[PDB]
Amino acid sequence: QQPTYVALSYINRFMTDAARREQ
Amino acid sequence: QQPTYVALSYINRFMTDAARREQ
Amino acid sequence: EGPLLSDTHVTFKLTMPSPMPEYLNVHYICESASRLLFLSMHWARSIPAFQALGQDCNTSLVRACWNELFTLGLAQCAQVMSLSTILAAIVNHLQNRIKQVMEHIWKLQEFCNSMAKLDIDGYEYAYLKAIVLFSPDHPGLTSTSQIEKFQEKAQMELQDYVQKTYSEDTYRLARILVRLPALRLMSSNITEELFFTGLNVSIDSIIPYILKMETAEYNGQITGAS
Amino acid sequence: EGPLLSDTHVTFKLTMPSPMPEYLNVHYICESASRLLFLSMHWARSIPAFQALGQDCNTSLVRACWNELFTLGLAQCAQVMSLSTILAAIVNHLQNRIKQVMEHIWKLQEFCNSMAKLDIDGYEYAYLKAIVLFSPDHPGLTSTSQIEKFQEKAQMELQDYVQKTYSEDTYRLARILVRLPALRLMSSNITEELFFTGLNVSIDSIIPYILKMETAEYNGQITGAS
């Protein structure tokens, strides 16, 4: 009915972690 | 025994013609 | 001697986030693409030979072939995703590199149509994915010999399946394998641009995260959503 | 209904300019690469279906696939050309993007070895070239439907040949077709850099010239040389 952005929320967490870890 | 640059000579002719024809 | 895939590997069920939004919604497209990417990688992790290679090797493998795996999944899931509707909406936000992206979209449309016209089934898609996953052609991999043997088993198992299931279609196996080169005519960089970069996403960087995630919480959230 | 290729299409005879020079000679490498390029294109022109398409369409086809045709010819002619000796000499002039060219050279070496290990014969090479030549995947072509049918005939004729000639090697056809994707992992831009650009050569521009040249004077000069 209404989208839950489950995969986008995981990707946001993964991106955030990878940026911290490198550069 | 000694190379004859047959294919290079054709390519030199083709390149020369294409440069004249365009630009 | 033993088989690469089992009947368990045929299951490939994508859950779309909702019915198609009324208007262009980039978030809906990326969420759907991201679910397909996660499913493709979680499917690869389900293969015993993949798990046996260990984390370093199996991260390198996915980093090398993710776009081919993802594109086979686009063709397989084209109806479920309403992919024709999604690609049209991108072309319009585009038209209202530019010409690279357009040729890519055209290649993706032609690929998806070529697979539909052949009626590629769930078994054939699982084997095609295994053949692209275990490709020894990529310069990164370290253990070419073992990956080559896994790819040879996928080829043999696909031929046995096509001969048993489509005995009257003498030429089917050859027809299916000559689709595989089309995947390498599509740039991973442009796939990333078309479905991801925008929502700021390097697939190469998040692949290790997707390969290590616990799928129970993720699948509960996907299935338990309205 | 009628066949795409005949036994006449098996002949693929490259004449090297001389034995290997003592020292690195870029002119010898490019002359040899240029003879292979000319032979690949003169071979394509010998196919009735290719001639039937007309000059516009058959120029577009070669412009789209020349690197794949050329690379199959490198694998077929690897012994005649002493290709292993040539690639080594390039790596050294290189080593004494740079790393793109190195990965490309590695891909070319692995491709050539994969074909040698399978003992790909003259018939199999002719059909593999016809399958890459009549690929409907390229965005340029205008007459996809007819090119698709020519590609399907090449596939059917290769399967019949492999079944008749290698009846005890059940899996051979599948093994050969899964080599074709490797050709699309190699950039035409880098092939052009490695074997041509230097001697200042755009292959896209000279393709029409090679397709229209009279081959009698050329072949006389090749054969009548010391």
Coordinates of N, CA, C and O in Angstrom, one line a residue, chain B residues 1-5 8, chain D residues 15-35 80-82 85-86 195 199, unseen atoms left out:
Chain B
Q1 N 61.9 -13.4 -45.3 CA 63.3 -13.0 -45.0 C 63.4 -11.6 -44.4 O 63.7 -11.4 -43.2
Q2 N 63.0 -10.6 -45.3 CA 63.0 -9.1 -44.9 C 61.5 -8.7 -45.0 O 60.8 -9.0 -46.0
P3 N 61.0 -7.9 -44.0 CA 59.6 -7.5 -44.1 C 59.3 -6.5 -45.2 O 60.1 -5.6 -45.4
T4 N 58.2 -6.7 -46.0 CA 57.6 -5.7 -46.8 C 56.3 -5.2 -46.1 O 55.5 -6.0 -45.8
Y5 N 56.2 -3.9 -45.8 CA 55.2 -3.3 -44.9 C 53.9 -3.0 -45.8 O 53.6 -1.9 -46.0
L8 N 50.8 -1.8 -43.8 CA 51.1 -0.4 -43.3 C 51.0 0.6 -44.4 O 50.5 1.8 -44.2
Chain D
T15 N 49.6 -14.6 -43.5 CA 51.0 -14.5 -43.9 C 51.8 -13.5 -43.1 O 51.5 -12.3 -43.3
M16 N 52.7 -13.9 -42.2 CA 53.5 -13.0 -41.4 C 54.5 -12.4 -42.3 O 54.9 -12.9 -43.3
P17 N 55.0 -11.1 -42.0 CA 55.9 -10.4 -42.8 C 57.3 -11.0 -43.0 O 57.9 -10.8 -44.0
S18 N 57.7 -11.8 -42.0 CA 59.1 -12.4 -41.9 C 59.2 -13.1 -40.6 O 58.2 -13.1 -39.8
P19 N 60.3 -13.8 -40.3 CA 60.5 -14.4 -39.0 C 60.6 -13.2 -37.9 O 60.8 -12.1 -38.4
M20 N 60.5 -13.6 -36.7 CA 60.5 -12.6 -35.6 C 61.8 -11.8 -35.7 O 62.9 -12.3 -35.8
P21 N 61.7 -10.4 -35.7 CA 63.0 -9.6 -35.6 C 63.7 -9.9 -34.2 O 63.0 -10.3 -33.3
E22 N 65.0 -9.7 -34.2 CA 65.9 -9.9 -33.1 C 65.4 -9.0 -31.9 O 65.4 -9.5 -30.8
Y23 N 65.1 -7.8 -32.2 CA 64.8 -6.7 -31.2 C 63.4 -6.2 -31.5 O 62.9 -6.4 -32.6
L24 N 62.8 -5.7 -30.4 CA 61.5 -5.0 -30.5 C 61.4 -4.2 -31.8 O 62.3 -3.4 -32.0
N25 N 60.4 -4.5 -32.6 CA 60.1 -3.7 -33.8 C 58.6 -3.5 -33.8 O 57.9 -4.5 -34.1
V26 N 58.1 -2.3 -33.5 CA 56.7 -1.8 -33.4 C 56.1 -1.9 -34.8 O 54.9 -2.2 -35.0
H27 N 56.9 -1.7 -35.9 CA 56.4 -1.7 -37.3 C 56.0 -3.2 -37.6 O 55.0 -3.4 -38.3
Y28 N 56.9 -4.1 -37.2 CA 56.6 -5.6 -37.5 C 55.3 -6.0 -36.8 O 54.5 -6.7 -37.3
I29 N 55.1 -5.5 -35.5 CA 53.9 -5.9 -34.7 C 52.7 -5.3 -35.4 O 51.8 -6.1 -35.6
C30 N 52.7 -4.0 -35.8 CA 51.6 -3.4 -36.4 C 51.3 -3.9 -37.8 O 50.1 -4.0 -38.2
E31 N 52.3 -4.2 -38.6 CA 52.1 -4.8 -39.9 C 51.4 -6.2 -39.7 O 50.5 -6.4 -40.5
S32 N 51.8 -7.0 -38.8 CA 51.2 -8.3 -38.5 C 49.8 -8.1 -38.0 O 48.9 -8.9 -38.5
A33 N 49.6 -7.2 -37.1 CA 48.2 -6.9 -36.6 C 47.3 -6.4 -37.8 O 46.1 -6.8 -37.8
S34 N 47.9 -5.6 -38.6 CA 47.1 -5.0 -39.8 C 46.8 -6.1 -40.8 O 45.6 -6.1 -41.3
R35 N 47.7 -7.0 -41.0 CA 47.4 -8.2 -41.9 C 46.2 -9.0 -41.3 O 45.3 -9.4 -42.1
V80 N 51.0 -19.0 -35.3 CA 51.5 -18.4 -36.5 C 52.1 -17.1 -36.3 O 53.1 -16.7 -37.0
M81 N 51.5 -16.3 -35.4 CA 52.0 -14.9 -35.1 C 53.1 -14.9 -34.0 O 53.5 -13.8 -33.7
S82 N 53.4 -16.0 -33.4 CA 54.2 -16.0 -32.2 C 53.7 -15.0 -31.2 O 54.4 -14.2 -30.7
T85 N 55.4 -14.2 -27.8 CA 56.6 -13.4 -28.0 C 56.3 -12.0 -28.1 O 56.9 -11.1 -27.4
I86 N 55.3 -11.6 -29.0 CA 54.9 -10.2 -29.2 C 54.4 -9.6 -27.9 O 54.8 -8.5 -27.6
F195 N 48.0 -2.3 -30.6 CA 48.5 -2.9 -31.9 C 48.5 -1.9 -33.0 O 49.1 -2.2 -34.0
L199 N 51.0 4.3 -35.0 CA 51.3 4.4 -36.4 C 50.1 5.1 -37.1

